[PDB]
Design a protein around this ligand. Structure first.
Ligand SMILES: [Hg+2]
Ligand SMILES: [Zn+2]
Length: 256
Protein backbone atom coordinates (compact mmCIF):
# COMPACT_ATOMS: atom_id res chain seq x y z
CA UNK A 1 0.00 0.00 0.00
CA UNK A 2 0.90 3.58 -0.59
CA UNK A 3 -0.34 6.81 -2.07
CA UNK A 4 0.20 6.05 -5.75
CA UNK A 5 -2.21 5.47 -8.60
CA UNK A 6 -1.47 1.83 -8.25
CA UNK A 7 -1.53 1.26 -4.50
CA UNK A 8 -3.22 4.38 -3.26
CA UNK A 9 -6.40 4.94 -1.22
CA UNK A 10 -8.73 3.60 -3.95
CA UNK A 11 -7.00 0.22 -3.88
CA UNK A 12 -6.86 -0.28 -0.09
CA UNK A 13 -10.21 -2.04 0.28
CA UNK A 14 -8.78 -5.05 -1.55
CA UNK A 15 -6.41 -5.92 1.28
CA UNK A 16 -8.38 -4.20 4.11
CA UNK A 17 -12.11 -4.58 3.38
CA UNK A 18 -12.68 -2.41 6.42
CA UNK A 19 -11.75 0.52 4.11
CA UNK A 20 -15.46 0.37 3.18
CA UNK A 21 -16.70 0.26 6.77
CA UNK A 22 -19.18 2.32 8.84
CA UNK A 23 -16.78 4.52 10.79
CA UNK A 24 -13.98 5.38 8.41
CA UNK A 25 -11.77 8.51 8.59
CA UNK A 26 -11.09 11.22 7.64
CA UNK A 27 -14.43 12.95 7.05
CA UNK A 28 -15.46 16.46 6.05
CA UNK A 29 -16.54 18.59 8.97
CA UNK A 30 -19.67 20.54 7.96
CA UNK A 31 -19.57 23.33 10.54
CA UNK A 32 -23.29 24.01 10.28
CA UNK A 33 -24.50 20.52 10.94
CA UNK A 34 -22.00 19.76 13.74
CA UNK A 35 -23.88 19.57 17.06
CA UNK A 36 -22.63 21.89 19.82
CA UNK A 37 -22.58 19.68 22.87
CA UNK A 38 -22.27 21.49 26.20
CA UNK A 39 -21.78 18.33 28.28
CA UNK A 40 -18.40 17.90 26.66
CA UNK A 41 -15.68 18.64 29.24
CA UNK A 42 -12.61 20.57 28.28
CA UNK A 43 -9.65 18.58 26.99
CA UNK A 44 -6.88 17.98 29.46
CA UNK A 45 -3.52 17.64 27.71
CA UNK A 46 -0.69 16.87 30.15
CA UNK A 47 2.60 16.81 28.24
CA UNK A 48 4.94 18.35 30.81
CA UNK A 49 6.84 15.08 31.36
CA UNK A 50 6.74 13.66 27.83
CA UNK A 51 9.72 11.61 26.67
CA UNK A 52 10.43 11.42 22.93
CA UNK A 53 12.73 8.65 21.75
CA UNK A 54 13.31 8.58 18.01
CA UNK A 55 12.23 10.03 14.72
CA UNK A 56 11.86 7.66 11.79
CA UNK A 57 10.74 7.65 8.18
CA UNK A 58 8.68 4.56 7.65
CA UNK A 59 8.06 5.20 3.99
CA UNK A 60 4.54 6.57 4.70
CA UNK A 61 5.31 9.54 6.97
CA UNK A 62 7.93 10.69 9.49
CA UNK A 63 6.96 9.58 13.03
CA UNK A 64 8.23 10.78 16.40
CA UNK A 65 7.92 7.98 19.00
CA UNK A 66 7.53 8.51 22.72
CA UNK A 67 8.23 6.37 25.74
CA UNK A 68 4.73 5.20 26.75
CA UNK A 69 5.71 2.84 29.60
CA UNK A 70 4.05 5.18 32.06
CA UNK A 71 1.59 8.08 32.20
CA UNK A 72 4.07 10.86 31.31
CA UNK A 73 2.28 12.59 28.40
CA UNK A 74 -1.43 11.82 28.51
CA UNK A 75 -4.72 13.05 27.22
CA UNK A 76 -7.83 13.06 29.39
CA UNK A 77 -11.13 14.93 29.46
CA UNK A 78 -13.08 16.12 26.48
CA UNK A 79 -15.22 13.23 25.13
CA UNK A 80 -12.79 10.71 26.65
CA UNK A 81 -13.27 8.30 29.48
CA UNK A 82 -9.99 7.31 30.99
CA UNK A 83 -6.41 8.27 30.33
CA UNK A 84 -4.85 7.92 26.92
CA UNK A 85 -1.03 7.77 26.51
CA UNK A 86 0.85 9.53 23.75
CA UNK A 87 2.62 6.95 21.62
CA UNK A 88 3.60 8.90 18.51
CA UNK A 89 2.99 11.80 16.21
CA UNK A 90 3.24 12.09 12.41
CA UNK A 91 2.26 14.49 9.61
CA UNK A 92 0.33 14.31 6.32
CA UNK A 93 1.45 17.05 3.88
CA UNK A 94 0.42 18.12 0.42
CA UNK A 95 2.39 19.00 -2.69
CA UNK A 96 0.66 22.41 -2.80
CA UNK A 97 -0.42 24.74 0.00
CA UNK A 98 -4.02 24.17 -0.95
CA UNK A 99 -3.99 20.45 0.00
CA UNK A 100 -2.39 18.13 2.51
CA UNK A 101 -4.83 17.71 5.40
CA UNK A 102 -7.01 14.64 5.74
CA UNK A 103 -9.95 16.17 7.58
CA UNK A 104 -11.56 19.14 5.77
CA UNK A 105 -13.66 21.91 7.27
CA UNK A 106 -16.61 22.76 4.99
CA UNK A 107 -14.55 21.24 2.23
CA UNK A 108 -11.59 23.45 2.94
CA UNK A 109 -8.25 21.56 2.90
CA UNK A 110 -5.23 22.81 4.87
CA UNK A 111 -1.54 22.56 3.97
CA UNK A 112 -0.87 19.67 6.41
CA UNK A 113 -2.35 17.75 9.30
CA UNK A 114 -0.48 16.60 12.45
CA UNK A 115 -1.76 13.49 14.23
CA UNK A 116 -0.78 12.80 17.86
CA UNK A 117 -1.82 9.17 18.52
CA UNK A 118 -2.86 8.02 22.05
CA UNK A 119 -3.93 4.61 23.41
CA UNK A 120 -6.39 3.81 26.30
CA UNK A 121 -4.40 2.67 29.37
CA UNK A 122 -7.15 0.35 30.55
CA UNK A 123 -6.00 -1.97 27.73
CA UNK A 124 -2.39 -2.30 28.86
CA UNK A 125 -0.52 -1.93 25.59
CA UNK A 126 -1.12 -0.41 22.15
CA UNK A 127 -1.69 -3.82 20.56
CA UNK A 128 -4.62 -4.64 22.83
CA UNK A 129 -6.11 -1.16 22.40
CA UNK A 130 -6.53 -1.61 18.65
CA UNK A 131 -8.94 -4.43 19.42
CA UNK A 132 -11.38 -2.11 21.20
CA UNK A 133 -13.91 0.44 19.84
CA UNK A 134 -12.51 2.98 22.28
CA UNK A 135 -8.83 1.95 22.19
CA UNK A 136 -7.34 5.07 20.61
CA UNK A 137 -7.65 8.87 20.75
CA UNK A 138 -6.07 10.93 17.98
CA UNK A 139 -5.68 14.68 18.30
CA UNK A 140 -5.61 16.33 14.88
CA UNK A 141 -4.03 19.74 14.28
CA UNK A 142 -4.30 21.63 10.96
CA UNK A 143 -1.35 23.56 9.57
CA UNK A 144 -1.54 26.66 7.39
CA UNK A 145 1.32 28.70 5.95
CA UNK A 146 2.08 31.90 7.77
CA UNK A 147 4.63 32.71 10.40
CA UNK A 148 7.18 30.17 11.63
CA UNK A 149 6.32 27.71 14.43
CA UNK A 150 9.51 27.57 16.52
CA UNK A 151 8.24 24.41 18.22
CA UNK A 152 8.46 22.56 14.89
CA UNK A 153 11.90 23.79 13.88
CA UNK A 154 13.61 21.02 15.89
CA UNK A 155 11.80 18.48 13.70
CA UNK A 156 12.62 20.49 10.57
CA UNK A 157 16.35 20.52 11.44
CA UNK A 158 16.58 16.73 11.74
CA UNK A 159 14.69 15.74 8.57
CA UNK A 160 18.05 15.43 6.77
CA UNK A 161 18.92 12.33 8.84
CA UNK A 162 15.73 10.48 7.96
CA UNK A 163 15.32 11.34 4.29
CA UNK A 164 14.68 7.83 3.04
CA UNK A 165 12.43 4.97 4.14
CA UNK A 166 13.79 2.97 7.02
CA UNK A 167 16.08 5.63 8.46
CA UNK A 168 15.72 6.62 12.15
CA UNK A 169 17.50 9.07 14.45
CA UNK A 170 17.59 9.75 18.17
CA UNK A 171 15.15 12.49 18.97
CA UNK A 172 15.07 12.99 22.72
CA UNK A 173 13.95 15.97 24.82
CA UNK A 174 11.37 17.05 22.24
CA UNK A 175 8.42 18.91 23.84
CA UNK A 176 5.06 18.30 22.06
CA UNK A 177 3.45 21.21 23.84
CA UNK A 178 5.16 23.37 21.21
CA UNK A 179 2.85 21.91 18.55
CA UNK A 180 -0.39 23.19 20.11
CA UNK A 181 -2.58 26.16 19.05
CA UNK A 182 -3.70 28.69 21.70
CA UNK A 183 -7.23 27.32 21.82
CA UNK A 184 -8.26 23.73 22.55
CA UNK A 185 -11.79 24.00 21.08
CA UNK A 186 -12.44 20.88 19.01
CA UNK A 187 -14.79 18.71 17.02
CA UNK A 188 -15.09 15.02 17.91
CA UNK A 189 -16.57 11.95 16.21
CA UNK A 190 -15.96 8.17 16.23
CA UNK A 191 -13.74 7.05 13.34
CA UNK A 192 -10.73 5.02 12.26
CA UNK A 193 -6.99 5.10 11.64
CA UNK A 194 -6.52 6.73 8.24
CA UNK A 195 -3.83 4.34 6.97
CA UNK A 196 -3.98 0.51 6.69
CA UNK A 197 -5.06 -1.44 8.72
CA UNK A 198 -7.69 1.33 9.10
CA UNK A 199 -9.00 -0.10 12.40
CA UNK A 200 -12.16 1.52 13.69
CA UNK A 201 -10.81 2.09 17.19
CA UNK A 202 -10.45 5.91 17.21
CA UNK A 203 -12.15 8.78 18.98
CA UNK A 204 -11.09 11.72 16.84
CA UNK A 205 -10.49 15.10 18.39
CA UNK A 206 -9.87 17.69 15.69
CA UNK A 207 -8.80 21.15 16.90
CA UNK A 208 -10.61 24.13 15.49
CA UNK A 209 -7.57 26.41 15.50
CA UNK A 210 -4.79 25.65 13.03
CA UNK A 211 -1.16 26.41 13.73
CA UNK A 212 1.07 28.34 11.27
CA UNK A 213 4.37 27.26 9.79
CA UNK A 214 6.50 29.40 7.47
CA UNK A 215 6.68 28.57 3.80
CA UNK A 216 10.33 27.56 4.42
CA UNK A 217 9.28 25.06 7.10
CA UNK A 218 6.61 23.47 4.89
CA UNK A 219 9.16 23.33 2.02
CA UNK A 220 11.34 21.10 4.11
CA UNK A 221 8.53 18.79 5.23
CA UNK A 222 8.02 18.15 1.45
CA UNK A 223 11.62 17.02 0.90
CA UNK A 224 11.32 13.58 2.47
CA UNK A 225 11.25 10.43 0.35
CA UNK A 226 8.82 7.48 0.22
CA UNK A 227 11.56 5.36 -1.39
CA UNK A 228 14.43 3.58 0.25
CA UNK A 229 18.05 4.72 -0.17
CA UNK A 230 19.22 3.74 -3.64
CA UNK A 231 15.78 3.57 -5.29
CA UNK A 232 14.33 6.13 -7.69
CA UNK A 233 13.36 9.26 -5.75
CA UNK A 234 9.65 9.53 -4.95
CA UNK A 235 9.02 12.60 -2.77
CA UNK A 236 6.80 12.06 0.26
CA UNK A 237 4.03 14.48 -0.66
CA UNK A 238 0.28 14.05 -0.73
CA UNK A 239 0.41 11.21 1.78
CA UNK A 240 -3.24 11.75 2.71
CA UNK A 241 -6.49 9.85 2.41
CA UNK A 242 -9.54 11.62 0.97
CA UNK A 243 -12.68 12.24 3.12
CA UNK A 244 -14.95 9.25 3.71
CA UNK A 245 -18.81 9.09 4.02
CA UNK A 246 -19.96 10.06 7.51
CA UNK A 247 -22.82 7.53 7.30
CA UNK A 248 -24.56 7.13 10.67
CA UNK A 249 -22.36 9.44 12.69
CA UNK A 250 -22.78 12.92 14.15
CA UNK A 251 -19.95 15.31 14.75
CA UNK A 252 -20.00 17.15 18.03
CA UNK A 253 -18.44 20.57 18.62
CA UNK A 254 -17.20 21.63 22.03
CA UNK A 255 -17.92 25.26 21.12
CA UNK A 256 -20.53 27.51 19.52
HG1 LIG B 1 -11.07 -1.42 17.15
ZN1 LIG C 1 -2.28 10.23 10.41
Amino acid sequence: WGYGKHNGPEHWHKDFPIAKGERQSPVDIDTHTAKYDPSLKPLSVSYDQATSLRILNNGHAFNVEFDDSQDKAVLKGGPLDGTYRLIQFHMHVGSLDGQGSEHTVDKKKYAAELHLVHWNTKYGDFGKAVQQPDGLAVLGIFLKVGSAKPGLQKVVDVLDSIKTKGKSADFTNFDPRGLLPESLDYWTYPGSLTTPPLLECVTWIVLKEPISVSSEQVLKFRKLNFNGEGEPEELMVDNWRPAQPLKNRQIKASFK
